[PDB]
Amino acid sequence: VPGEMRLASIAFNHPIQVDQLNSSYFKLSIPTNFSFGVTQEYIQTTIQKVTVDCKQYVCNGFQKCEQLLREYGQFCSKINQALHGANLRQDDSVRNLFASVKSSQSSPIIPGFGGDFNLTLLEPVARSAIEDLLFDKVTIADPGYMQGYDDCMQQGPASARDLICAQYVAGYKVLPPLMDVNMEAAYTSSLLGSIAGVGWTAGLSSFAAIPFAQSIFYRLNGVGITQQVLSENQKLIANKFNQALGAMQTGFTTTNEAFHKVQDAVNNNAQALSKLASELSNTFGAISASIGDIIQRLDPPEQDAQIDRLINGRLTTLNAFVAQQLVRSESAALSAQLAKDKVNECVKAQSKRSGFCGQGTHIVSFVVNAPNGLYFMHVGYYPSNHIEVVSAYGLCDAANPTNCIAPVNGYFIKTNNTRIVDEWSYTGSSFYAPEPITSLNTKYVAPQVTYQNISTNLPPPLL
Amino acid sequence: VPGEMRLASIAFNHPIQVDQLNSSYFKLSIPTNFSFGVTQEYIQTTIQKVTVDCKQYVCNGFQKCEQLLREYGQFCSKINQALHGANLRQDDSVRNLFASVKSSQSSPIIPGFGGDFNLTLLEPVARSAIEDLLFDKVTIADPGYMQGYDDCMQQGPASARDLICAQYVAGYKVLPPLMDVNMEAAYTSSLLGSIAGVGWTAGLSSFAAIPFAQSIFYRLNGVGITQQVLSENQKLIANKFNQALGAMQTGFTTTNEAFHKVQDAVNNNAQALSKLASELSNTFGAISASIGDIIQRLDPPEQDAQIDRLINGRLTTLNAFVAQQLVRSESAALSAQLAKDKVNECVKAQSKRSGFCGQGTHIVSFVVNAPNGLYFMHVGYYPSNHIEVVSAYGLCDAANPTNCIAPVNGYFIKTNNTRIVDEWSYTGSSFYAPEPITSLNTKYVAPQVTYQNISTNLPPPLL
Amino acid sequence: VPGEMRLASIAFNHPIQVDQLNSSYFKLSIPTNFSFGVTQEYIQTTIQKVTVDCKQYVCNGFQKCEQLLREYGQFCSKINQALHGANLRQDDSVRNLFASVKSSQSSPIIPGFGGDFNLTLLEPVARSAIEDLLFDKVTIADPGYMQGYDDCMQQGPASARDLICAQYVAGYKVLPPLMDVNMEAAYTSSLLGSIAGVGWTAGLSSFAAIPFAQSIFYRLNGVGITQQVLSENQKLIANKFNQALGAMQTGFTTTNEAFHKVQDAVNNNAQALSKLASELSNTFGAISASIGDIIQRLDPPEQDAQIDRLINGRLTTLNAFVAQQLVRSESAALSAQLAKDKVNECVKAQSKRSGFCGQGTHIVSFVVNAPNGLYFMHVGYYPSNHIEVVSAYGLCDAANPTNCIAPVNGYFIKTNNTRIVDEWSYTGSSFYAPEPITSLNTKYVAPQVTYQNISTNLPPPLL
Amino acid sequence: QLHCSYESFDVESGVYSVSSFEAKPSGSVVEQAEDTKIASQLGNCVEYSLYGVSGRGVFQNCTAVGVRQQRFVYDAYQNLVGYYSDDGNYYCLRACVSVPVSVIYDKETKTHATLFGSVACEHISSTMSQYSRSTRSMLKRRDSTYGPLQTPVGCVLGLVNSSLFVEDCKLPLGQSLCALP
């Protein structure tokens, strides 16, 4: 066997230290390697919609209880009103979301889409391989809307234990979703078909429809990687990205936090229904929880007092249940508003904000359907193997103080590369690679006291 | 009469398909026509503030009930404490909002402001035509703060049915709003006077005060429409925009969702007050809901038991009511924080985010006062009549590989216009219109394998 | 003594009026002086974590009550389940926040860091001077986790009145925080060490490590102040900024709203615990609130009825308490998500959004630890002494209509400075200071009818 | 009452609602054919008995509404809206007017003032026939030397029309009115 537990201290990872310096130059930390990686998120958008036949939940067709229930008839009316209002808000939240999800234009999607990138998210024209993994791995109780009560009838298995069959005992009705999974898939594939037509400005008007690999290279120019590196390492980029996609096949366990959230959303819907079902067996000072039993066992002066007590606790439980559902419905609507914002900032565009997504700046993100919500995947760019180098704030002509330049989207670093015959070199912001300093990499600025005084070889400006 | 209902399938609009291509050129979808349009939103910022005279609600001055109520005196103290804390939070949320709404500087506002744009939002120095439509169309019960109880007195109509008159029966007091509608109008006109002084960088310091029509043209350059088109079509832009404003006169029906939300905010305030009023007639095992009736009909050993039961249910109702108000107050504060963010991103500036507002990028938005909140109008730019054209990623000199260019805020398209004598032409991102390629429309870039090799006529660079 | 109250009207500050004009020029309002200022915010991230020994809270070890409590054993199980789930969510919210707070790299921090800026926020290697002020000024009840119950024992002062000692009476257990204040300080100093390495693009990869004063000047170029002014007035900038820091020593009173919010967060945690403690003395039709008293005073047929009534009210109070805690826990999680977003947009970068922070654009912000949350300080730039000047939309060559220019991040103003021998001059957007118009301050644009026709002295373009 | 409600001797500054005035009923009005002076009294605030139905309120002669023969006209909450009498006249019944009260307190100066809501100063007097609890004499040490003051929010005592313009008193009364110290 394993032995005793071990007391440990929680480790604190110290961030890499870089010395701040005075004078005209400074130390710069820059990445030399990277990996793509994927992080995921689950955003709930809806609550399972239910209604309750209040009268049937309180009493199963007995005439004595019905006569008493006429005194309390307005409580069932209020329960029906409140549940109906909650269900309307759920359906409107879904329609408002999908109105923003729809694009006005897209590419067709074929097998082989994406070129060098494998893309197991592609439809098998369907849903997707990732959606089928997610729906099968989560322990989902069997849906209604298909023949339902006929599988709780004698024409079906003796092993059925469904909450579908508890619906007619308790008077529940679970309502259908307002979309249909095929229409949800049509919206989802329409989002996938809009990716790589949203670059080159706007994206809310013109639709660029350009090669997917080329749009990724364009996004990598957008985070400060120079195009020379991107041109040489195209195959390596494809390999790293496909490794990051391959890691998704191990991400459907409860050690994955986003997956665990999906499972708990399903559990919560089942939990609410089971609470109302369990309360049918609870007496509230009654001899039995069946109204028919206390009708058989009691004379009518005693009988009606016992029935009234039983009714009062049953009504009180329904009132508590409705209050719970109203709170859950409102939180789902607020969560659906967050989902709408992420689709318009991370799915349809590159984000420059950080915060959202995995922390590695941001490149293309994807959406698939989940139980009760949307499941996001975000591809990020993660640094490795950082080195420290000498860098300068800017450069000027020693013979002419108005000729001053500053690097664009990158840094001026002291040369440590044997191809380059100059004291200074240009590198990208997100990736270490020296290059010659030319007019394409720089901008003209006003002079400053910290800029270097270059006595000879400067090519922008040549003078 | 109309006949039977018709079963139908929900339509799915397929987005316009554009073929993705390999090689050095691609198909581009671009708009050729447009319309302005207006979408609206209602953001609640407050709850109607109330207080409850707890002792009077439970008992109408009877001495026997007062002696019993001394045992429960701390429950009324807690009810007063909780309601008072909620009312302070409402008033602070209003002040925090208006502190961000205020500008440090503005234009004067006259009739004829806006030039060619009609602007029925202009004050009639007042509120506005739109505000008067909104306040009259919503079914608002008559306000207090004006003589109030004197219109529930015998010196007034026999047809009064106001909740104002139910206030003194139940011990309610509806508190006044903390602003005054004239001061709200002063803040609202100050926002209108700041529009078109927020362009040309910053806007949090300098105030530009430039012509309104010119600021709209400047915003249309900001979404990729070329200035040549804007110069020619100024009259057409004014006509389309005024048609979009004219559509607001039909927007005050319950088919308009934002209008429907305003009506329901008013209904909810009335609903809460009516719930407490209705409960005054409910017995809780009492002979009568009047304490004076059970004092007259019962000897004091029996009387006090009946009074205590009546008190217990009345206290329980007030506790439930306070819990409801605390939840509503908190949700209003969170909603008011959203309103503050929209004023600082959609009203005072052009938004580049999408998501927020009507989906047509974004140009100028407006705010007016509403019942319990702010009502936003967002003008958007909606595409029509899309066409597909041939386009190139960039162009280079065939004699010199370092001379490469890429379009700025637009595309390089194959020429289909008889004015232009070149193989390639420049167009804007949001509107199809060919133009000559010149230095103003382009930037110098590093060479790429997908750029075209131009053998003759290039003017930037000429070499 | 003071006399009678005075009725007053609430003042409305009119914003500065600027006349809108027609024709080719316009009036511009621009600041000529400024002050730095500091605003603060408190964002709660957590609830004090508690558990309740349900059985002990209801009954203090009596065997007669325990026999009755077996009938209700599932209610205590549900209370424990719900409280445990709430505590897990609190701990996960903390870990998710600190995962985003951590940087991958930082500077070392020494005394004298920041150069000319004083920085009382520097660690005394510790927490900070500001943190020690905040923790001492708020009236915090003494923490547990240190020897606790041994200071409620006879081996301690007779004046102890702690809720720590009420824990063993009621069966509470306050749980420890999941971080440790030393680890919180390590994260906080790591944020301080990342400031001024996040400029010059990206900031999510490379770490610039440049002089703090120089990074402030770079941020001031980012809000439209010209570098000529910044070069001359470096000492004055340091003096104004240090005055704004000096004002923090008077900010720990309840007149400061952010400080008042911190005090109320502490009060709310204490309030919840005191509510459960006070209810131990409340009878629910019982002869005494002690179960041992009613065991001594009653024969067992009467005794058990009284004990059951006492149990029912005690269970009902715990159910209400759990519902309150679940609501508070969820609101804290949502508030913690807001804190995460502000750290990634205001602490680690300059914000261009407005809205967030004090309203003076935005420059560097700081974070310190607070009771139950984070306390932010935002340095803003506040205008003063505005003047109106004549300005032009742009300038062109009168001899050649394609030679047209427009100012970059600033304005073209009519000259009122005796150093300059030109009709037009350039000024910054946030600060009035004339300068010569040169190629560094401008961009080439297409011609417009409102641009000035310059007949002689233009240097960009010279032609 | 405020000190007791907060269990303290140092209540924080603010505007606080307190117990309202009831009204104080006049002599009873009785109709019951089957003792002879007050079968009617058109308009005050009186106790009444109408063929075994009892309550209190203000009667007003008004236009007929319900079906005469059935006498008692009710609303949806079973309150007596009106009555057809044995003189052939319909009387509207509107109960009585209670007067809401709130007080303005500043802790720093330890001074106070009061507000009666939207009732209007025509119904307010230096001593009251309407009754709630004990006295308001602490106000009346200064406020019995002044008339009641009509404001847009309501009728007040001790408030003084200064016509000052102040950004924030920390004691707003609603609308644009502010209770400056």
Side-chain angles (χ1 to χ4, degrees), chain A residues 10-23 26-31 223 257 261 278 282 334 352-356 359-361 381 383 386 393 402 404 408-411 429-431 444-448 450-451, chain C residues 75 78 92 96 99-100 102-109 113-114 178-179 183 186-187 190 195-197 199-214 221 227 231 330 334 337 340-341 344-345 348 353 440:
Chain A
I10 294 169
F12 174 71
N13 183 26
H14 285 270
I16 298 169
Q17 301 296 296
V18 180
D19 305 298
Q20 186 173 51
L21 300 176
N22 66 16
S23 192
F26 63 97
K27 290 174 61 161
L28 168 71
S29 170
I30 186 165
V223 299
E257 183 63 17
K261 290 179 195 186
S278 77
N282 193 19
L334 295 171
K352 299 180 180 180
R353 295 177 59 183
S354 188
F356 293 49
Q359 300 298 287
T361 78
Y381 166 103
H386 302 66
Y393 294 102
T402 64
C404 292
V408 172
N409 298 345
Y411 303 97
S429 290
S430 178
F431 191 84
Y444 289 71
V445 296
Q448 290 288 262
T450 64
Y451 293 170
Chain C
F75 288 100
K78 287 174 182 184
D92 287 350
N96 286 339
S100 73
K102 194 168 66 185
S103 175
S104 64
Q105 42 201 348
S106 74
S107 177
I109 296 177
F113 177 87
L178 171 54
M179 284 306 312
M183 292 185 73
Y187 280 117
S190 298
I195 294 171
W200 316 104
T201 65
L204 305 172
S205 63
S206 60
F207 185 84
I210 70 149
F212 179 81
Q214 190 62 38
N221 279 323
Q227 182 61 48
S231 301
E330 186 58 10
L334 295 171
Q337 181 57 45
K340 174 173 169 172
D341 288 344
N344 288 306
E345 292 199 354
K348 294 179 189 171
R353 295 177 59 183
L440 298 175

Side-chain angles (χ1 to χ4, degrees), chain A residues 341-451:
Chain A
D341 288 344
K342 289 198 184 182
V343 169
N344 288 306
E345 292 199 354
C346 307
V347 177
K348 294 179 189 171
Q350 185 174 30
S351 174
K352 299 180 180 180
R353 295 177 59 183
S354 188
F356 293 49
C357 313
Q359 300 298 287
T361 78
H362 175 254
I363 62 167
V364 65
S365 297
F366 306 99
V367 166
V368 296
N369 299 271
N372 308 305
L374 299 178
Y375 182 97
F376 289 69
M377 287 154 286
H378 305 284
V379 183
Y381 166 103
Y382 297 88
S384 181
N385 299 349
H386 302 66
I387 64 173
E388 296 184 327
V389 300
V390 170
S391 175
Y393 294 102
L395 306 170
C396 301
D397 184 358
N400 179 329
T402 64
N403 291 335
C404 292
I405 61 168
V408 172
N409 298 345
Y411 303 97
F412 287 149
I413 58 172
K414 197 76 177 66
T415 300
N416 205 53
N417 189 305
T418 54
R419 292 170 181 175
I420 301 170
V421 297
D422 198 280
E423 299 311 314
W424 301 98
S425 64
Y426 173 82
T427 184
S429 290
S430 178
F431 191 84
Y432 179 75
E435 292 177 350
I437 299 168
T438 185
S439 68
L440 298 175
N441 302 334
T442 190
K443 64 182 180 181
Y444 289 71
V445 296
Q448 290 288 262
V449 69
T450 64
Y451 293 170

Side-chain angles (χ1 to χ4, degrees), chain B residues 86-157:
Chain B
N87 288 334
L88 289 177
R89 291 169 71 81
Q90 289 296 306
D91 284 343
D92 287 350
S93 297
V94 168
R95 287 192 286 190
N96 286 339
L97 175 62
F98 278 123
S100 73
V101 167
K102 194 168 66 185
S103 175
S104 64
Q105 42 201 348
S106 74
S107 177
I109 296 177
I110 63 166
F113 177 87
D116 291 345
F117 301 81
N118 184 293
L119 301 191
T120 63
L121 294 171
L122 291 172
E123 188 174 352
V125 64
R127 293 193 290 254
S128 65
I130 289 300
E131 282 160 311
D132 286 351
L133 284 169
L134 183 55
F135 279 120
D136 288 352
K137 285 275 192 179
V138 177
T139 61
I140 300 171
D142 286 356
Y145 296 138
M146 69 172 285
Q147 70 196 24
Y149 292 8
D150 287 356
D151 300 326
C152 304
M153 280 186 63
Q154 67 178 319
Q155 300 174 324

Side-chain angles (χ1 to χ4, degrees), chain B residues 32-44:
Chain B
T32 66
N33 206 343
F34 66 93
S35 181
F36 291 114
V38 180
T39 64
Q40 313 93 34
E41 186 58 282
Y42 168 65
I43 302 182
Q44 183 172 9

Side-chain angles (χ1 to χ4, degrees), chain D residues 30-35 51-52 71 86:
Chain D
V30 178
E31 186 183 81
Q32 194 273 356
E34 183 177 342
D35 290 345
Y51 289 91
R71 286 181 189 273
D86 293 338

Side-chain angles (χ1 to χ4, degrees), chain B residues 96 340, chain C residues 36-44 121 130 134 243-262 342 346 355-359 362 364-368 370 374-380 382:
Chain B
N96 286 339
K340 174 173 169 172
Chain C
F36 291 114
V38 180
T39 64
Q40 313 93 34
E41 186 58 282
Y42 168 65
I43 302 182
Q44 183 172 9
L121 294 171
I130 289 300
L134 183 55
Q243 287 171 359
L245 290 178
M248 290 303 296
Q249 302 305 299
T250 65
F252 297 96
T253 70
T254 55
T255 68
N256 182 285
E257 183 63 17
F259 180 87
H260 180 73
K261 290 179 195 186
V262 176
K342 289 198 184 182
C346 307
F356 293 49
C357 313
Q359 300 298 287
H362 175 254
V364 65
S365 297
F366 306 99
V367 166
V368 296
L374 299 178
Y375 182 97
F376 289 69
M377 287 154 286
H378 305 284
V379 183
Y382 297 88

